[PDB]
C-alpha cells in the first residue's frame, strides 16, 4: 500500500527540484547572476588597459 | 479612504457569524441571515470609518492653516484629497 | 499580494474541515504548506540578479507594510518553505496545523518586510503561538515558554521607544527613508542590538533557548532552530547596517568580544551536557555567533557569507533535531545512557547521524565548510586575531560531537530498530540540499 | 543656501521622475554616476541609489578582471 | 520521578500556622489613612519634580528598599501581653 | 577508586594559564611586535626633537 | 540597497558639519519659572550645602516607609497594649524616626561623596556617581550576611549610572532633537516652517530641555 | 498470577468518623487515592462546609476545615512553607480561619486516604465568613440544606 | 428666550412621563421591562448633544442598558448618565462637584440594591466604605474650592488650590495609592455594575479634563505608584477579580502617563479600546474568548491593545519622557506574566459551556461577538484616525 | 503472535486481543530510578548554586577575567586595523567626538 | 536543450526593465507622500477646549 503522504510529498519536492534545475540551466546568464553580466564588459577594459600599462613601462 | 474597507467589513461580519454560531454550539454556517446582516453592518460601518478619516483630515488641514501654518500647495494634496487609496 | 491573500484564506480552510474525514484533513494541511514552496520557487525564477538590489516592490498605502525582496530574504524564504512541510509531516492535531500555519505566515511576512515598525509588529505576533506550543500539558515545560516569551518581550519593549523616536525624527518608518535621514544613531542602535542579541543566542542573555528547543516537540524544535535565529541575522542585514552605521562601528569591539566569549563558553559548556537534545541546543550558539561576527566584519563579502552560513545551519541542524525526535519518540527518553549500539540497530539512521554530525563540524563536501571558510575570510580581512580564535577552537566542538556520536552509536546494541519510510523521507530534503549546495551551490 | 538646496532637490525629483531607457538597457546599471556638489550624498536618495548601483557594477567588474588576469597568469 | 519536600510535615505545617491565630480586622482603616495622608502631604513633592535626577533616583531606590510587604505581615507584638 | 571531584584550584588555574600561553601565542607575538614598533617610534621622537 | 558585496551607508557620510537648523519663525522658548530652591539643589560648588539642601527629599521616603510599617503594626495591636497611648506613641514614633533618619543619613552620604568626587576630579562624569553609589551600598551593607556587601553597592552604583544616563546623558545627546518641521541636515525636503513652536500643556515632570523643542504652557 | 482473590471495593474501603460543627457523629466511607474532602462532599455535607482553594491554577479545588488528632499528624503530606503552594496555604490560614486556628487545624485537600487512615476520626473546623465571586460565598451562618455535591460545576469565574 | 433650552425641558418631561409610565406598568402584574429599557435608550438618544464624545458615551450606556432588569436601577443609571454628560459640560467647580456627587450616590445605590445570595453582606460593606471615602474626598474638594473662591473671588479654576482639585480628580479613577477602594469594589459587587464603573465615569472625567482643565504641576509620582503597584498586585493576587482590579489600576496609570505628556488622541483611542475590552469582559459566557481579552491587554502585537499602548509610547517619546516611558515598559512586561497565567487558566482547559434553562438562550451573543471583531480594527487604527 | 492486520491489509487495533499488540511504545526502555533522579538533578541543578569561596574565585578569575581579556584584545585589534589602513584615532563608544566612518571619497 | 533556451526566451520576453523602474518610482513617491503627511501632522499643539488665546483662530461658538 502506498502511504497517504507519498504522492503529494514526491510531487512537491520533485517540482521544486525541477524548478531549481531549470533555473540553473535555462535562465539567462545575466538573469541568473551578475557575474556573467560583467565579464564581457570587463574583458575589453582589461584589454585596453593592458596597453596603457605597457606604455607606462 | 481605503479601497478595501467594505470588503474588510464583510470579512469581519463573516467571522462574526462564525463566532456567533461558535458561542451557541451550532455549525459555523447555520442561520445565514445573521451572516448577511453582519456583512451589511460591517460594510456600512467601515465605509463610515473611511469617510470619517477624510472628514478628520480636512479638519486637520483647515485647523492647521487657520492657525497661521501655511503650506506649499504640493503637500496640501496629502490632506485636501478624497483619495481612493 | 493577491496570490498571498489567496494562500492566506486557503490555509485557514483547515478549521472549516469536519474532523470526520481525517485523510482529507492531512491532505489539505500538507498541501497548504506545499503551495508557498512552489510560489517561492516561482519568485526565484522571476528574480533578476542583473536588476536592482531590491525587486518585486509593493506598498499597502499609508499602512506601512513595505514588502521587497533581496537575495537574503528569498533564500531564507526558500529554506523555511522547505522546512515547514517536514514539520507538518510530524503533527497529528488540527491545532498544531493552525499554529504552524500562522507561524509560517508571520515568518514569511517578516522575511520581506521593509518597515521597521512593520517588522516590530509582525515578528513578535507569534510569541503567544510559541508559548502555547512549548508548554503543552502532557510533555512540555511551562518554564521554557515563560522564559522565551519574557526575553522576547523584554527585547521588543526596549526597542519600541527607539523605533518611535526615529519615526518621529524622520517622519516615517520605511527603511529606504530611515536610511537617508540624519538620526540619533546611538539609541536606535542600542535597541536593535538588544533585540537581535536576544533573538540570536548571544551571551549573556541567551538562556531561554536550551530549555525551549528541548521542551518543544520535533516540529516546533526544527522551526525554532532553523528559522527564528535567522530572523536576527536578516534583521541586522536589512535594518541596522543600512540605518545606523556609526553605532555599528563604535560597538564593534563590544559585539566582537561578546560573540567570541559566547562561542567559547558555549563550546566548552556543551561537553558537560548529558542529553542529546541539550547538546544539539548548545551547538547552534557557536554558529549564530560566527554569523554575527561575519555580519559585523563587513570586510569583503560579509552579507553573502552570513547568508550562506544561515542557510547551512537551517539545513543541517534540523536534521539533528529530526534524528533526536525519532530516537525520543521511538524510545520515550532523551537520556544519553540509554543509547548504545545504534549502528547495528539503526544502520541508515546512524549513518545519517554521522553525516549530519560531520555537517555540523564544517567538513568539505558540505555547505557548512564553504560557509565557515567565507565567514573566516571576512573575519580575517578585518583582523587575524579573531580569525585565529575561531580557527583554534574548531577542535572543541567536534570533540563533543564525536564523543556523543560514538557513545550513542557504537557499543552494546540496545534500543530501537532502524528508521521508517516516513522518517527517511523527512531526512531526505536536508541531505539532498546539503549535497547540492556543497557540490555546486553556484554556477 | 536653503532655497538653493530646495530648488536642487526639486529638480532632482523632476529629473528622476521623468527618466527612462530602452534597447535592452537594464536600469540600475547606468554607464555613469552623476557628479554633484552635495555633502552627505544621502541628501538626495535617487542619486544615492544610482551611485550605489554604479559602485556595485564597478566592484563586480573588478572581480571579473581579477578572474581574467588569474587565467592569463596561469597560462 | 518526584523530588521530596524538604523538612518535616509537622514542623512545616506549624510554620504555616505561625502568627495566624488572629482575627482579621477591616481594611477600611488602612484605606482611609492612606487617602488622608495623600490628601494632606502629597503637596510636599510639588517642588520635587525640578530636583536633579540623581537625587530622585536615590530617593526612589531608598523608598523601594525600605518598603515592607502588607501581605504576610507579622510582628512579635501580636502575641505579647505587655510592651 | 574515584571520588568524582573537581580539580585543585591552584593547579587548575596554572594549567589553564599554561594552555592559554601555549595555544594563543600569535596574540602575544603581534602585541610584542606592536610594543617594539612603538618603542622604535618613541626613540625616534625623543631623538628627532632636540 | 541590498547586495552581498557591501553596505552603502557605511561609506556615505558628510564631509562638512552643518549649521543650525531654522525651526520656527520665532526661535525662543517659553517656560514657567523654576523655584530657586531646586536651582540651589543643582548647585554643586559646595558639597555641604548640596547635601543639606538635598536631604529632606531623600528623608521623606524614609518618613513614608516608617509611617507605613508603624500603621501596619498598629492595625495588629492587642487591646491591652493600645490603651497605653504614651507607649504606643513612643514605639511607633521610634520606628518612624529610625527609618527616616536612616534614609536621611544614606542620602546625605550620597550627596556629600558625589559632590566631593566632582570637586576632586575638576570635571563632571558618571564616575562620581559610581563612587557615591558604591559607598552608599557599602555603608548600607555593612554587618549583614555575605552575598550582600557586594550586591548592594552594585545596586546603588547601577542606579546612579541609570540616573545619569536617563536624566542628563540622553537629553544632552539629543539637545537638537526635533519632531516637527524640517528635518535637520535634510531641509532640502521641503517641510514648511511653523511660525511658533508647538504649544503643549506638559506637566512639571515634562519640561523642555531646549528652547527649540516645543512650547510649554496653555 | 494465580488464584488471587477477585478485586472488590472492600479491599480499598476506608472509614472515617466525622463529627459536624453541631456535634453529630457521622459515618463516611472513603477510597484510596482520593481526597478526604471529595468523600465529604460525597456524603452530603452542606455547601457551607467548603471553600475555594486560594492558589494559582488550583482554584477549582474545594476543601473543608478539619482537626487532625495527634497520632495521624505524620500521615499529612508535607508542603513547603517557602513554596508558592505554601504561600497559598498560608493565605488560607490568614483569611478563612482567623482566630479559629488550632494546632490541629488542617486542610482535607492534602489528605490522601490510605490503609492507615482506616478508623481515623476527625471533626469539622469553624470558619469565618468569606466571598470569592458572585456565585459562591459564605454568609458566616451554617443554615442551609443545599448539598455542595448538587452544584453542577465549579466556576472559578 | 428659553427657545434655545428646549432639550433640557424635554429631559424633565421625559423623566416625569417615565415615572408615571413605570408606576402604571407595575399595577398590571408585569415581570419584565424591556419596553422600559428601549424607551430609556430612546430618551438617552434624544437628550444627547452632537459631540463625538457625547454620542460615544450615549451609545456605550445604550449597550449597557441590556444588562439590567429593575426599573429603579434603570432610573439611577439614567440620572448617573445625566450627571456624566453634564460633567462633560461643566465649566465651573460647582457643577463639577454636583455631578461628581450625583454619580457617586448613584454608584453607591446601584451597588447596594442589586446584591443577591450570601455575597450581599460584603457588597454592602464595600459600598459603605466607598460612600465614606467619597464623602471625605468630597469634603476635601469643597474645602479647597471654597479656599479658591476666597482667593480669586471668581469661578476661574487656577492657582495653587487647583492641586487638590487634581487630587480629587485622581481619586475618582482609583489612582494608586488612592486605588484600594476600586479593589474593594472589584472584590464583591456583581459583574454588571463593575462593567459600568470601568467605562463611563472615567470617560466623562477624561473628556472634562481635556475640555476644561489645566494645572501647573505634575502627577508623575502618582503615575509611578499606579503602574508599579498595579503590576505587582496583578502578578501576586490569585483572585481573578483583584487581578483585573490591579490590571485596571495599571491601565489608568498608563492613561495618566499619556495625560501628563498631552497628546490626548492616544489617550482617547486607548480609552476606547480598553472600554471595548471591558464590555467584552463582563458579559462572557464562553471561556475560549477570555484569553483574547488578555492578549488585547498584554499588548500582544496583532490586536488592538498593543497599538493602543504603542502610540502612547510614541507620544511619550515625542516629549522624551524617558523615566515614565521606561517605567511603562517594565510594567507592560510584568503584565505578561499574569496575562499568560490567565491564558493558561482559560485556554488550555476542556471546553464546557452551560446551557440556558429559563429561556434567554445566551442572551449576550451579539455584543460579545461584535466586541470580538477588534482584530479588524487596527486596519483603520494605524492611520492618523482619532486625532 | 497477535494479528494486528487482516490478510488484505486493514490494520486491526486488536483492542480485545489477548496477545500484547506491537505498537509505538513497543521499544520503550525501562527507566532506572537512580538515572531518573540524576537527570532530574542535572536538569534542576540551579538549586545548587552558592556564593562559596571556590565559586566566587572561579567566576572572577575565569569568567570576568577572560571577558576583560577578550574585550582588550578586540580593542587592540580594532586600533591596529585602524592604523593599518591609514586612519586617525576613531571614536569608540565613550571616546570623545572624533572621526567615524572614513569617507569613500577620501584617500587615506 | 531547446527547452532551456525556450524558457530563457520566455523569461526575456516577459520581463520588462521599465515596468520595474516605474514600480520603484511609485514606491518612492508613495513613501515620500506618506512621510511628508506624517511629518506635517506631527506639528500637534494640545490645549484644553476652553483655551481661547491658544485657539483664537478656531471659529467656535459658545452657548453658556
Curated annotation (Swiss-Prot), chain C:
Catalytic reactions on record: a ubiquinone + NADH + 5 H(+)(in) = a ubiquinol + NAD(+) + 4 H(+)(out)
Functional description taken from the UniProt entry: Core subunit of the mitochondrial membrane respiratory chain NADH dehydrogenase (Complex I) that is believed to belong to the minimal assembly required for catalysis. Complex I functions in the transfer of electrons from NADH to the respiratory chain. The immediate electron acceptor for the enzyme is believed to be ubiquinone.
Main EC class the enzyme belongs to: translocase
Membrane topology summary: Multi-pass membrane protein
UniProt name for this protein: NADH-ubiquinone oxidoreductase chain 4
GO biological process: ATP synthesis coupled electron transport
Protein EC: 7.1.1.2
Keyword Electron transport belongs to the record: yes
Residue stretches spanning the membrane: 1-21, 27-47, 71-91, 93-113, 114-134, 148-168, 187-207, 217-237, 247-267, 279-299, 308-328, 335-355, 362-382, 385-405, 423-443
GO molecular function: NADH dehydrogenase (ubiquinone) activity
GO cellular component terms, A-Z: mitochondrial membrane
Coiled coil regions in record: none
Cell compartment(s), UniProt: Mitochondrion membrane
UniProt keywords, alphabetically: Electron transport, Membrane, Mitochondrion, NAD, Respiratory chain, Translocase, Transmembrane, Transmembrane helix, Transport, Ubiquinone
Keyword Transcription regulation: no
InterPro entries: NADH_Q_OxRdtase_chainM/4, NADH_UbQ_OxRdtase, ND/Mrp_TM
Family statement drawn from the similarity comment of this UniProt entry: Belongs to the complex I subunit 4 family.
Pfam families found in the cross-reference section: Proton_antipo_M (PF00361)
UniProtKB/Swiss-Prot annotation, chain I:
Reactions mediated catalytically: a ubiquinone + NADH + 5 H(+)(in) = a ubiquinol + NAD(+) + 4 H(+)(out)
Membrane-crossing segments per the record: 6-26, 38-58, 59-79, 93-113, 128-148, 163-183, 193-213, 217-237, 244-264, 265-285, 289-309, 310-330
Keywords: Electron transport, Membrane, Mitochondrion, Mitochondrion inner membrane, NAD, Respiratory chain, Translocase, Transmembrane, Transmembrane helix, Transport, Ubiquinone
Enzyme class: translocase
Protein's UniProt keywords contain Electron transport: yes
Main subcellular location of this protein, as a coarse class: mitochondrion
EC number: 7.1.1.2
Keyword NAD: yes
Compartments reported by the entry: Mitochondrion inner membrane
Single annotated GO MF: NADH dehydrogenase (ubiquinone) activity
GO cellular component labels: mitochondrial inner membrane
Membrane topology of this protein: Multi-pass membrane protein
Family per record: Belongs to the complex I subunit 2 family.
Functional summary from the UniProt entry: Core subunit of the mitochondrial membrane respiratory chain NADH dehydrogenase (Complex I) that is believed to belong to the minimal assembly required for catalysis. Complex I functions in the transfer of electrons from NADH to the respiratory chain. The immediate electron acceptor for the enzyme is believed to be ubiquinone.
Protein name (Swiss-Prot/TrEMBL): NADH-ubiquinone oxidoreductase chain 2
